[PDB]
Amino acid sequence: QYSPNTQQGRTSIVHLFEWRWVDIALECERYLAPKGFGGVQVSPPNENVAIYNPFRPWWERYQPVSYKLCTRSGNEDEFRNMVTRCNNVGVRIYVDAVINHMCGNAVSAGTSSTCGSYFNPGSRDFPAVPYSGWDFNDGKCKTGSGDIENYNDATQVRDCRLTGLLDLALEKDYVRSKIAEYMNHLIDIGVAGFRLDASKHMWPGDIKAILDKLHNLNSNWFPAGSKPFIYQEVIDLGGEPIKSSDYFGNGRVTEFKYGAKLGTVIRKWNGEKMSYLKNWGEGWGFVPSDRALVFVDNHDNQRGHGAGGASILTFWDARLYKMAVGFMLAHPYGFTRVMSSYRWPRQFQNGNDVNDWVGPPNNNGVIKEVTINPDTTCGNDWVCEHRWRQIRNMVIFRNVVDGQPFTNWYDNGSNQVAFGRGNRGFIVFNNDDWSFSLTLQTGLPAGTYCDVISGDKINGNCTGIKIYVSDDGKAHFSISNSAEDPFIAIHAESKL
Ligand SMILES: *[C@@H]1O[C@@](F)(CO)[C@@H](O[C@H]2O[C@H](CO)[C@@H](O[C@H]3O[C@H](CO)[C@@H](OC)[C@H](O)[C@H]3O)[C@H](O)[C@H]2O)[C@H](O)[C@H]1O
Ligand SMILES: CO[C@H]1[C@H](O)[C@@H](O)[C@@H](O[C@H]2[C@H](O)[C@@H](O)[C@@H](F)O[C@@H]2CO)O[C@@H]1CO
Ligand SMILES: [Ca+2]
Ligand SMILES: [Cl-]
C-alpha cells in the first residue's frame, strides 16, 4: 500500500492545485515526463457545491455533492483523457479523495452544483449518490452542537461534523461501498493512488474497511498485484490523543511536522539553525520515513488554512522557499511532494489574509488555461513552482541520488551546512548573514560539475556556477549571503 507506484527513477509528485484536466494532460507530455516527475496530485474530481458567496472559493471543491466526475477541472471524458495520456508517458495520477464528508450542513438545497445534481443538506439528501439521512453520523455524534468541539476527545473528532461538514457514517457497509464504488471507478480509469482528505476525522478501522474493497491498479499499465498508493491527510503536530501512527496500517501519512519545523528552522525562529538539521527525520519526532509524505507547504497551510502556522514557507517567500524545497528534495527522508499554486490577492489585516478564499485564476468562474511563457514560466497567474529551475533541477537531483545514503554532513554550528548522497550528489546551504567560502569533502568522483541551482548542464557546458572536485573528493564552495539563491547542488548527471 505504501509504494507510490511511480516509474523507477521518478521520486516526486507535484500538486497541480486547481488545474484543469486538459492542462494537466499537456503538462504531463510536454514537461512532467521529460523532466522526470513521478506523478500529479489532482484536485477532487467529484462533483462539488458551487459557492457564489464568496465567488467560487477553492475550498468549494471539498464539499461533495456526488461522485460524478464533473467539476470545474472538467468532465469524465476529459479526466480519462488526462489519466491515459499521463500514464502513457509514465506520469501517475493521484486523486484527492474527499470521503469523510459531504457538503456543509448549512448549504442551501438546490442544484448549485458543478454538474447540476440536486442535493438537500438540510434533509441529508444526496440523490445523485444516493445518500440519505441514514448515511450520516447525526445520531452518532455526542456533542451539543453536532460539530467537532474538542480535539482531546478522539471519538467526537471522528463521529462529529468538521466545521459543519456533514459526516458520513463510514461504519456502514453501504456507505463504505458507495465510496469504494467511486474509488474503484477511478482506479479502473488508471489512477495510481489517493490522498485521503481528513483522515484524522475517520476511524483507522473504517478506512481499512474501505481500502479492502479497492481494486488493484489497471493491469494495462501496472504489473499484476499493484496496490493503489495511499497517503492519509492527518494533521498531527503532537499533543493530541490521535496520532498519525494510528493510520500506519492503511498506508502513508502526511507529515505536517515536516514543513512546520523546516519553516521555523529556515526562518531561524526561536533561535533555530540549519546546523540542527543534522539528524533531520525520525530524530525530530517525525513518523518513519517509509510512511511519510513530505512537503514544505500544501494547498491548505500556504494560505493559513492548515497546520504549521505562520512558519510555513511558500512561493511568496521565493528565496527561502527555494532553499527549503531544495533541502527537502536532497534529503532521503520520506516521499516528496512539490507544490504548484496560483497567485491570489493576498491581503493581510490584523495578521490574517482576508482573501485566503480566492479560487484559481478565472474568467467569470471559468478556470483559466495554463499558458507557457518562452522562458518556460507560466502565465495566467499560475505560479508553476515546479517549473522554477531551482526546483525542477532538485526534483531531478532526487532521482539521480535515489537510494544513496545521507553522508559527508558538514555545518559551521550556525546556518551553513552541507551533505551528500552516497557518491552521486552533494548540496551546500548558506543561511547565515555572512559569506560561506570553504573546501568540503563531497564524496563525489573527481571532475567539473555544474551547479543545478544557479544554472544547467547544456551541451557539455554549465550555464551557472561550476564546481571542481579533486582526486580526494574535496571541492571549494563559495556562497555569499547576498546570492540570489544561497545554496549550490551538484550530482552525477550534472558532471561535465
Ligand atoms: C480536506 O477537506 C476539507 F473540507 C476539510 O479539511 C478542506 O477544508 C477546506 O474546505 C472547507 C469546505 O469548503 C472549508 O470550510 C467551509 O465550509 C464550512 C461548512 O459550511 C464552513 O463552516 C461553517 C467554513 O467556515 C467554510 O470555510 C474550510 O475552511 C477549508 O479549509 C481541506 O482543505 C481539505 O484538505
Ligand atoms: C528562465 O527563468 C527562470 C529564472 O531564471 C529562475 O530564477 C526561476 O524564476 C523564479 C524565481 O526563482 C523565484 O524566486 C520568483 F521570482 O519566481 C520566478 C518564476 O516566476 O525560474 C525561471 C523558470 O525556470
Ligand atoms: Ca468523520
Ligand atoms: Cl496534504
| Nominal resolution (angstroms) | 2.0
Please list the residues that pair with 16 across neighbouring strands: 340
Grid coordinates given for 193: 493512488
Supply the Cα-derived Rg of the chain in whole angstroms: 23
Cα 465 from Cα 478, distance rounded (Å): 10
Grid coordinates given for 34: 521529460
Residues 6+ apart with CB under 8 A from 235: 200, 254, 256, 306, 307
Ligand lying nearest the CA atom of residue 61: 1
Grid coordinates given for 117: 445534481
Contact 125, 103 (CB under 8 A): no
User: Does residue 163's CB lie within 6 angstroms of at least one atom of ligand 1?
Assistant: yes
Grid coordinates given for 364: 467569470
Residues 6+ apart with CB under 8 A from 485: 319, 322, 323, 390, 453, 454
Cα 388 from Cα 484, distance rounded (Å): 13
Amino acid in position 158: R
Instruction: Determine the atom of ligand 2 nearest the C-alpha atom of 387.
Output: 24
Cα 188 from Cα 109, distance rounded (Å): 32
Strands ordered across the beta sheet of 447-450: 436-441, 474-479, 466-469, 447-450
Residues after which a C–N gap over 2.5 Å breaks the chain: none
The DSSP-derived string for 173-189 is HHHHHHHHHHHHHHHHH
Grid coordinates given for 10: 521518478
User: Does residue 388's CB lie within 6 angstroms of at least one atom of ligand 2?
Assistant: yes
Could you identify the residue written with the cell 507544490?
Answer: 339
Bind-site residues for Ca(2+): 100, 158, 167, 201
Residue nearest to atom 6 of ligand 1 (CA): 198
Q: Which residue pairs, CB below 8 angstroms and at least 24 apart, start in 472-476?
A: 472/441, 473/441, 473/442, 473/443, 473/444, 473/445, 473/446, 474/439, 474/440, 474/441, 474/442, 475/426, 475/439, 475/440, 475/442, 475/444, 476/437, 476/438, 476/439, 476/440
Q: Where are the domains of the chain?
A: 2-403, 404-496
Cα 183 from Cα 214, distance rounded (Å): 7
Distance from the alpha carbon of residue 370 to the mean position of ligand 1, in angstroms: 26
DSSP structural state of residue 455? -
Cα 387 from Cα 401, distance rounded (Å): 20
Burial 348-374 (b: 16+ CB within 10 A, else e): eeeeebeebbbbbbbeeeebbebebee
Burial 456-495 (b: 16+ CB within 10 A, else e): bbeeeebeebebebeeebebebebeeebebbbbbbbbbbb
Cα 381 from Cα 371, distance rounded (Å): 9
Cα 5 from Cα 11, distance rounded (Å): 10
DSSP structural state of residue 32? I
User: Does residue 256's CB lie within 6 angstroms of at least one atom of ligand 1?
Assistant: no
Pick the closest to residue 424 from 330, 337, 295, 335 (CA basis). Answer: 330
Cα 316 from Cα 405, distance rounded (Å): 32
Cα 92 from Cα 13, distance rounded (Å): 8
Contact 265, 274 (CB under 8 A): yes
Q: Cβ–Cβ contacts within 10 Å for residue 1, how many?
A: 16
Bind-site residues: 100, 158, 167, 195, 201, 298, 337
Contact 444, 423 (CB under 8 A): yes
Q: Cβ–Cβ contacts within 10 Å for residue 310, how many?
A: 11
**61 in helix, strand or coil?**
helix
Is the C-alpha dihedral spanning 90, 190, 228, 58 positive or negative? positive
Q: Cβ–Cβ contacts within 10 Å for residue 309, how many?
A: 13
Please list the residues that pair with 215 across neighbouring strands: none
Query: Within 13 Å and on the Cβ side, how many CA atoms surround 73?
Result: 28
Chain Cα centroid distance, residue 196: 12
Grid coordinates given for 245: 501512527
Query: Within 13 Å and on the Cβ side, how many CA atoms surround 477?
Result: 27
Cα 157 from Cα 154, distance rounded (Å): 5
Pairing state between β 416-421 and 406-411: antiparallel
User: Does residue 318's CB lie within 6 angstroms of at least one atom of ligand 2?
Assistant: yes
Bind-site residues for chloride: 195, 298, 337
First to last CA, the chain: 40
Contact 301, 307 (CB under 8 A): yes
Show which residues are catalytic. Answer: 197, 233
Q: Torsion over CA of 321, 307, 416 and 443, rounded to 10 degrees?
A: -90
Q: Cβ–Cβ contacts within 10 Å for residue 347, how many?
A: 11
The DSSP-derived string for 362-403 is EETTEEPP--B-TTS-B-TTB--GGGSHHHHHHHHHHHHTTT
User: Does residue 299's CB lie within 6 angstroms of at least one atom of ligand 2?
Assistant: no
Grid coordinates given for 70: 464533473
Residues 6+ apart with CB under 8 A from 149: 143, 156, 160
Instruction: State how far the alpha carbon of 448 is from the alpha carbons of 414, 454, 466, 473, in Å.
Output: 29, 15, 7, 12
Pick the closest to residue 268 from 256, 276, 280, 257 (CA basis). Answer: 276
Method of determination used here: X-ray
Chain Cα centroid distance, residue 486: 25
Pairing state between β 92-97 and 366-367: unpaired
User: Does residue 356's CB lie within 6 angstroms of at least one atom of ligand 1?
Assistant: no
Ligand lying nearest the CA atom of residue 359: 1
The DSSP-derived string for 245-264 is GGGTTTSEEE-HHHHHHHHH
Query: Within 13 Å and on the Cβ side, how many CA atoms surround 253?
Result: 24
Instruction: Determine the atom of ligand 2 nearest the C-alpha atom of 376.
Output: 23
Residues 6+ apart with CB under 8 A from 185: 67, 69
Amino acid in position 380: N
Cα 480 from Cα 436, distance rounded (Å): 6
**317 in helix, strand or coil?**
helix
**Fold that domain 2-403 belongs to in CATH:** TIM Barrel (3.20.20)
Q: Cβ–Cβ contacts within 10 Å for residue 248, how many?
A: 18
Pick the closest to residue 322 from 394, 416, 401 (CA basis). Answer: 394
Superfamily of domain 404-496: Golgi alpha-mannosidase II (2.60.40.1180)
Ligand lying nearest the CA atom of residue 292: 4
**437 in helix, strand or coil?**
strand
Residues 6+ apart with CB under 8 A from 242: 151, 154, 157, 200, 234, 236
